[PDB]
Structures are given as structure tokens and as C-alpha cells.
What we know:
Energy-transfer acceptor. Its role is to transduce the blue chemiluminescence of the protein aequorin into green fluorescent light by energy transfer. Fluoresces in vivo upon receiving energy from the Ca(2+)-activated photoprotein aequorin. By secondary structure, the protein is an alpha+beta fold. Helix content is about 25%, strand content about 30%. It folds into 3 domains: about 1-20 and about 320-388, Recoverin, domain 1 (Orthogonal Bundle); about 20-250, Green Fluorescent Protein (Beta Barrel); about 250-320, no CATH class. The two termini are about 20 Å apart.
Amino acid sequence: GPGSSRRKWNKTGHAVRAIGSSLENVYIMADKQKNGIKANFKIRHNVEDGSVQLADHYQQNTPIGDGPVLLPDNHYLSFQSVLSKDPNEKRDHMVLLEFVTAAGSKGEELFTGVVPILVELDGDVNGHKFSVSGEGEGDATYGKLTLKLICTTGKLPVPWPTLVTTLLKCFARYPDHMKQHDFFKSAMPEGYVQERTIFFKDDGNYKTRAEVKFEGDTLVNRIELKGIGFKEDGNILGHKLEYNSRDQLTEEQIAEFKEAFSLFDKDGDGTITTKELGTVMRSLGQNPTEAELQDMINEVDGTIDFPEFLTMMARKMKDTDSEEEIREAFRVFDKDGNGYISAAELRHVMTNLGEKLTDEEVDEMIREADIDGDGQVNYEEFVQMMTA
Ligand SMILES: [Ca+2]
Ligand SMILES: [Ca+2]
Ligand SMILES: [Cl-]
């Protein structure tokens, strides 16, 4: 009866959960004509009511003039973003931290140390005008970008997370001779134009034009942004998006991981040996298994860069069981997204996972989870099954 049904729910739920966000990959494609690169990627913004706002990005980058900037093979850039606040700042603001790495030239030389950054954005969204003024530093050796961004015209009329991708791929860490493949640094100092359109599902879109380039020793990102088509009551103009995640890496955790990592970076490389990973990780008070560390390693390919290392760290600490993990699992089961799991949708998932169950076993599961007696499983009824 009730005992095996709950198990079925909890174990199926566990399996679906286990499929694991600050992290996101971008496939960079060479574009031969126009002498640049292009890309398409989706960002999934969490909404305060537990749903998700999709943002579809399309991007072209082209050099500012003029001469030699060689094109890379298609490759991946991997991004991890940390958003926080400054408790001393009274203005509407974002602290942003970003860590970026590639998986498989004089401009390169301009990135060997810590580079200052100016960011400026002029925006107009549904005729609401705004500017953002920003300042920071970038440290390509560590694939690291650090920004403090302020809204100068008062209260930002859209959410901060929707401007993150708009507000410097030149600070990405390119490994050991993928550097021959680094469009963003070799375009410097003259730099490159970076254009996007971002389509927010069931809402509006942005078009942005940015110039990234050196002005003296300062790396500048100057951006014009225009938005049209948004719902005044939507997730964007209505500010219905979560700024942060509970499970997220901390700015303080990161300073410590970096000191710990650089202790073993014997060459000034921004790299540690594969065989050092255990030591480093145990000094940061965690205790990974003999074969787990192996999995972290074999997923490298013999060295680990800082963003790579930070991705490993963010993977543990990822609360397995989060309000947000449970919401995503709910969506796997509620295929038509009407807010209820029907007997037919539960069968579907079971059958697709390879979990053999009779019709009667499936009705028992529904009956067990269904508090209100309407024959289907809503989100709060689901959470009670997912929870120990
Ligand atoms: Ca449904
Ligand atoms: Ca129900
Ligand atoms: Cl976005």
C-alpha cells in the first residue's frame, strides 16, 4: 500500500533531481565572412513564483577594423556568475563576479596581469530610460572578472539578472595553446563589436550593441541597449525575478578557494596539477572519495584551471533538495505545465525512465500523494512526497 508508493515517489524524484544554476556553456562558432564569431545560447532566469523565464540570446562579434585577428575552431566557453550586494551601497546596484574558461599575439600580452575595467550602458526599455555605470578588474590568468555596477538614473526599470550577459569574454581563461584560438584578446587593443538580440519568452526583447576595447590601460565596455514588446505586468518590468540563489558560491568562499588554489600554482599559471586536487580540496575542509576525485579529474580531459576548480566546488554544496531543484523536478512530471500531475503524465515518466509499473501501481501513487482528493498531484502535494 502507502509505503511502497511513497518510496516510488521519493526514489524516482531523487533520480530526476540528481540530473544536475550559476553555470552555463556557450558554443562559439567561427563566422568566416565578417571575420568574427557568433553564438546562440539560452539563459534560464528563476522567477519568484517558482517558474522560469527563458532568455534566448543570439550574438555576433566583429573586430573594430582592421588587419590580423585570426579565427578559432568552434569551442565552448563555460561561465559561472556570482551576484551579490554591497551592504554599504544605498543606490540600486549589482556586484557581479564571473569565472570563464575555454574547453576544446600582441593582444594576449595585454591580459597577463590585473586589468582595470570601465562599463557603461545606456538603456531604453519600453521608453523607460536608464544608465548603468560600472567599474572593476579582470584577471584572465584566473578567468576572472569582477564588477560593481550602479544605476545612475535611480531605480533600474528591469531586473539586474537580465543585464548580466550584456554587462567581457576577453577575460576568459584559454588553456595551453587554445590561445591561437582566442578571438577576444587578439582583437585588442582596437577591440571588437559585440551585438545581441535577446528574446524573453512570452515577453519582450533586447538589442544591444557594445564596443569592448582599450582606452589607455583601461578595458572599456560601452553599451547601447533598446527593449520593446515587454509586459508592464510581466516578469521583467514587474521585477518578478530572483536576484540570487541560496546555494550559490560566496564572495568570501571564493577568496579562500583562490588563495588555496594559488598556493599550489607553482608556475604562476593559474593552473594546478591533477594530482594536487585532493590536497587542495582537503585544505578547504572537504573530504572527497578516492573515485569521486577521479571523476572530477577525468571530466577535466593534465592540469586544472581556476574556473574549472570553482565549478567542482560549486557542484558540492549545490543543495540536493532545493526549493528550485524540486520545482524543476515538478516540471519533468507535469509535461503540459498546467500545474497538476495526472495519472497519464506519471505513467509517461515511469515508462520513459524504465520504471516498470502497472496501472494499479500508478493509481496508488497518485492516491497516496493526492491530499485534496481531486485525482491529481499539485505542487505542494508533490513536495510532500519529495521530502524526507
Ligand atoms: Ca499536467
Ligand atoms: Ca490533488
Ligand atoms: Cl538574460
